[PDB]
Design an enzyme around this catalytic site. Structure first.
Site, PDB file in Angstrom:
ATOM      1  N   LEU A  42      11.422  39.847  -4.616  1.00  0.00           N
ATOM      2  CA  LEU A  42      10.912  41.030  -5.413  1.00  0.00           C
ATOM      3  C   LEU A  42      10.997  40.701  -6.838  1.00  0.00           C
ATOM      4  O   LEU A  42      11.824  40.047  -7.409  1.00  0.00           O
ATOM      5  CB  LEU A  42      11.961  42.294  -4.991  1.00  0.00           C
ATOM      6  N   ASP A  43       9.994  41.417  -7.346  1.00  0.00           N
ATOM      7  CA  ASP A  43       9.972  41.273  -8.866  1.00  0.00           C
ATOM      8  C   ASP A  43      10.796  42.018  -9.448  1.00  0.00           C
ATOM      9  O   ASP A  43      11.792  42.620  -8.965  1.00  0.00           O
ATOM     10  CB  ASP A  43       8.472  41.453  -9.400  1.00  0.00           C
TER      11      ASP A  43
END
Ligand code: SF4
Ligand code: SF4
Lengths: 123, 77, 121, 210, 190
Positions: free
Chosen positions: B36-37
């Protein structure tokens, strides 16, 4: 004018990139948290997840910006837009500037190749 | 508080960019284990707090990196 | 000790918001002595700024110290009313205290580009 | 009178530069108008000196604005206008600011100034660091662009009409029924005015040797 | 003298210190005399009497569809392209009225005939955007376009409001004698 308006902050310019990253982070949290208010407020047709994926893809647009002060102006413009949107200052026809591709398909013949551009000489 | 991690897994399952919904362990890191960012991290945390009706400050939102910290935070109410 | 420079309640004079100041001359001369002490302590004796404000408040303080009544000194100063004169002496005092840290007597730190103050000639 | 007075204004401004050599780059006078040429990090101390000195007490912001010359590297110049209602005098203060760098805001000193600063913001995109309620004023809310800026065209980019389908007004790219016809193309090809004489007093231009 | 510095000959004037506001006891009238004005509304009846005076005089009002208000000869209303005596169009395609118009209402197409004289194939004023400055009357050297003093010409469509050459030559046809009278009375002051 002594006192400011409700959600405003004094515009102030960070000297580092990490502090700016923290501020844009808190900013995306503010948009994403206020996204259920905008569907009630501006009476949109569509769902809250489409508002949220638009806020995401409008921060996708400026992900790879290198220069610090261009990130700075971009943060200030984003905070001004949050400021207008969270109140009732924008109306429901300027809130839907943000969604032109969703509301209606204009018709046939979106040109893709050079031939379809060229039959109506690049439109 | 039982049945909490099942709810957090149900919230975290409805997203994208996770090619393994079975990789949600109770100690899953958002960035490392789930790919995930930063925007994804503060998307999932807002979707977590939306499920309950609670509201979180900035110092308690910026620190949450794993689902272990979410299940540690959950009992504020 | 403290000093009051502007009464915001009292009897009215022509300027509203500014009311009559009780005993303006001791307030005035103590505020002056603060100006003289600050710019003698903190500004270096070459600089034009402290020289003229030293001469300025010296010649201004001489009128206050040497004459008694209200109306004659507020004509001999030639600036406004004595309440208003106390306010602007307070103000130049706060200015002289900001100048010790902002330090204007140096050389200029930001030189202009050569193609910048060129309009249409 | 007027010759003596403009020669007096010259000397007053020579004094103002000599009192603050760290901050004041230039001064220029043209016909009982005084302009002070100031760096952008030099705004706040000069404006406190203009508010606070007894010789120099301007007290009252009248109007501020920017002007762009795109042919300079620092694009906008931000000009301030003050009025000493005691000494019956006007003074002008010019700084500079690129599209992306700021100028600091004098709204801590001058209370009327903030409304002016956000006006010049919307017309020019010039930043005022340290300013509560910096956002647009007197344009459209969703308006993209800064109008009083030389890359922005006359008629703008967009126009408004009522779409029947969506039952709302829609914003569309620009289409005109009559195109704009500027007649600036067709100006004079001879120089229209000469250089003109000077109003410099004899005391303030450089001596010739011998 | 010499002034203090920071200070000019613009001192406060003699008497700008205004006196203390007088108390209740340094008042010239009695409290009973003041209370008669207080309870019996002394100046209310005065302003009542003023509006009653205005009730009994002859009003300013005029009938519009049967009387028009007072106007000047230099007044401006709908346009007209004049003509010469012995019948001639008088617009010589000289293009000055188009170059001056502060709202760009004029649009002229000019073409020359075999005769060597100059006229306009297409003359046009957009009256949605004419602003009535009368500069177009002031610029034409041959006095070919004027401002007739008509204002009663409100229309129901915009296509009616686009004046071509034919409509303005008709307006110069109808308004001629009053037009010539107004220009002849104006002509000393121009
Ligand atoms: S009256 Fe003014 S706006 Fe109208 S056509 Fe003449 S110059 Fe143009
Ligand atoms: S009306 Fe006058 S300015 Fe216009 S084309 Fe005719 S002569 Fe020229």
């Amino acid at each position: 004018a002594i006192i400011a308006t409700a959600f405003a902050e004094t515009v102030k310019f960070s000297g580092s990139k990490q502090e700016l990253q923290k501020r844009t982070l808190a900013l995306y949290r503010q948009f994403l948290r206020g996204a259920p208010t905008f569907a009630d407020l501006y009476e949109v047709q569509f769902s809250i997840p489409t508002i949220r994926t638009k806020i995401r893809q409008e921060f996708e647009r400026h992900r790879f910006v290198d220069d610090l002060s261009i990130q700075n102006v971009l943060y200030a413009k984003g905070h001004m837009e949050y400021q207008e949107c969270i109140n009732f200052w924008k109306q429901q026809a300027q809130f839907l500037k943000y969604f032109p591709e969703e509301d209606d398909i204009q018709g046939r013949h979106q040109p893709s190749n050079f031939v379809d551009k060229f039959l109506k000489n690049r439109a | 508080r039982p049945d909490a991690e099942k709810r957090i897994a149900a919230v975290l399952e409805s997203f994208d960019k996770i090619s393994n919904p079975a990789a949600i362990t109770p100690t899953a890191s958002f960035a490392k284990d789930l790919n995930l960012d930063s925007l994804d991290t503060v998307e999932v945390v807002v979707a977590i707090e939306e499920e309950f009706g609670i509201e979180i400050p900035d110092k308690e939102a910026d620190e949450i990196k794993s689902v272990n910290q979410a299940v540690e935070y959950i009992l504020a109410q | 000790q403290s000093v009051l420079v502007q009464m915001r309640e009292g009897t009215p004079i022509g300027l509203t918001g500014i009311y009559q100041h009780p005993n303006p001359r001791p307030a005035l001369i103590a505020l002056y002595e603060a100006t003289l002490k600050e710019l003698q302590d903190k500004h270096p004796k070459d600089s034009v700024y402290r020289q003229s404000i030293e001469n300025l408040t010296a010649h201004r303080k001489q009128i206050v110290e040497d004459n008694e009544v209200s109306e004659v000194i507020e004509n001999k100063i030639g600036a406004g009313l004595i309440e208003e004169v106390v306010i602007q002496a307070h103000e130049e005092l706060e200015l002289a205290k900001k100048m010790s840290e902002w330090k204007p007597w140096e050389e200029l730190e930001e030189k202009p580009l050569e193609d910048q103050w060129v309009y249409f000639n | 009178r007027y010759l003596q007075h403009v020669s007096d204004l010259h000397q007053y401004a020579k004094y103002i530069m000599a009192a603050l050599p760290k901050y004041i780059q230039g001064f220029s006078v043209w016909k009982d108008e005084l302009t002070l040429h100031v760096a952008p990090s030099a705004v706040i101390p000069v404006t406190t000196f203009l508010r606070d000195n007894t010789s120099t007490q301007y007290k009252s912001i009248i109007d501020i604005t920017a002007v762009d010359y795109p042919s300079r590297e620092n694009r906008f110049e931000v000009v301030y206008n003050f009025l000493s209602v005691r000494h019956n005098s006007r003074i002008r203060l010019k700084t500079y600011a690129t599209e992306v760098t700021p100028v600091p805001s004098i709204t801590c000193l001058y209370e009327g100034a903030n409304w002016f600063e956000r006006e010049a913001y919307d017309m020019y995109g010039v930043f005022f660091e340290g300013h509560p309620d910096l956002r647009r004023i007197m344009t459209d809310y969703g308006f993209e662009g800064h109008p009083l800026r030389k890359d922005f065209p006359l008629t703008g980019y967009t126009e408004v009409r009522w779409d029947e389908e969506k039952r709302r007004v829609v914003y569309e790219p620009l289409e005109l029924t009559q195109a704009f016809r500027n007649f600036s193309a067709g100006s004079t090809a001879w120089e229209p005015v000469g250089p003109g004489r000077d109003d410099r007093p004899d005391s303030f231009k450089l001596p010739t040797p011998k | 003298n010499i002034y203090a510095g920071g200070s000019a000959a613009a001192a406060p004037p003699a008497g700008f210190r205004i006196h203390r506001p007088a108390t209740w006891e340094e008042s010239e009238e009695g409290a009973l005399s003041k209370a008669t004005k207080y309870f019996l509304l002394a100046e209310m009846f005065r302003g009542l009497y003023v509006v009653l005076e205005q009730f009994f005089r002859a009003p300013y009002t005029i009938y519009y569809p049967f009387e028009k208000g007072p106007v000047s000869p230099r007044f401006r209303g709908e346009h007209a392209l004049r003509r010469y005596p012995s019948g001639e169009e008088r617009c010589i395609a000289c293009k000055l009225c188009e170059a001056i118009c502060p709202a760009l209402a004029i649009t002229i197409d000019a073409e020359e005939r075999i005769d060597g004289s100059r006229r306009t194939t297409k003359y046009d004023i957009d009256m949605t955007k004419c602003i009535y400055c009368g500069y177009c009357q002031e610029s034409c050297p041959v006095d070919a376009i004027v401002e007739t003093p008509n204002v009663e010409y409100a229309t129901e469509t915009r296509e009616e409001l686009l004046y071509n050459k034919e409509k303005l030559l008709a307006n110069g046809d109808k308004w001629e004698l009053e037009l010539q009278y107004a220009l002849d009375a104006d002509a000393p002051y121009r």
